Design a protein around this ligand. Structure first.
Ligand SMILES: CC(=O)c1nc(NC(=O)[C@H]2CNCCN2)sc1-c1ccc(N2CCCC2=O)cc1
Ligand SMILES: CC(=O)c1nc(NC(=O)[C@H]2CNCCN2)sc1-c1ccc(N2CCCC2=O)cc1
Length: 130
């Protein structure tokens, strides 16, 4: 309906704002662009479902997220991918893992603080009706 499309538009505006705040944070620069499979040949060996903050922005604008849970699944994928590709004790790995966990924690904290629970419930009930 028209009222439902307004609901999803508000969700998109919210998700764009959250993702922008993550993308300008200096700690998360390593997650802002896709890994180049040419420059990092072993990445596809480990990671079959790549995700990054620029791809999240593209999916918002293609109307792929109907709930905050769909969005958080891709944030969690950015994080879990980084943990899998950086599993070793060396400091480069440990630095990326720390940033990956910080990215996840920061996204969840913004949403917990700023997304109304009833708005998210509405989004979910519209989604379940389709
Ligand atoms: C995404 C991620 O998790 C990631 N992890 C890394 N870890 C390491 O290099 C660890 C791995 N263990 C051995 C020691 N070195 S590099 C890296 C990464 C991030 C971004 C790019 N970009 C930016 C755009 C062009 C491009 O290709 C490439 C790679
Ligand atoms: C090829 C590649 O790996 C790469 N290419 C880029 N291209 C551009 O920025 C254009 S950035 C980037 C890259 C390399 C290493 C990191 N790492 C290693 C762990 C600490 C850390 O930050 C992050 C990103």
């Amino acid at each position: 309906s028209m009222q439902e499309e307004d609901t999803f538009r508000e969700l998109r505006i919210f998700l764009r704002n959250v993702t922008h705040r993550l993308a300008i944070d200096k700690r998360f620069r390593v997650f802002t662009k896709p890994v180049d499979p040419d420059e990092v040949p072993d990445y596809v060996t480990v990671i079959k479902q790549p995700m990054d903050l620029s791809s999240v922005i593209s999916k918002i604008d293609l109307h792929k997220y109907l709930t905050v849970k769909d969005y958080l699944r891709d944030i969690d994928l950015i994080c879990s991918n980084a943990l899998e590709y950086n599993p070793d004790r060396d400091p480069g790995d440990r630095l990326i893992r720390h940033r990956a966990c910080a990215l996840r924690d920061t996204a969840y904290a913004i949403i917990k603080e700023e997304l109304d629970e009833d708005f998210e419930q509405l989004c979910e009930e519209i989604q379940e009706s389709r």
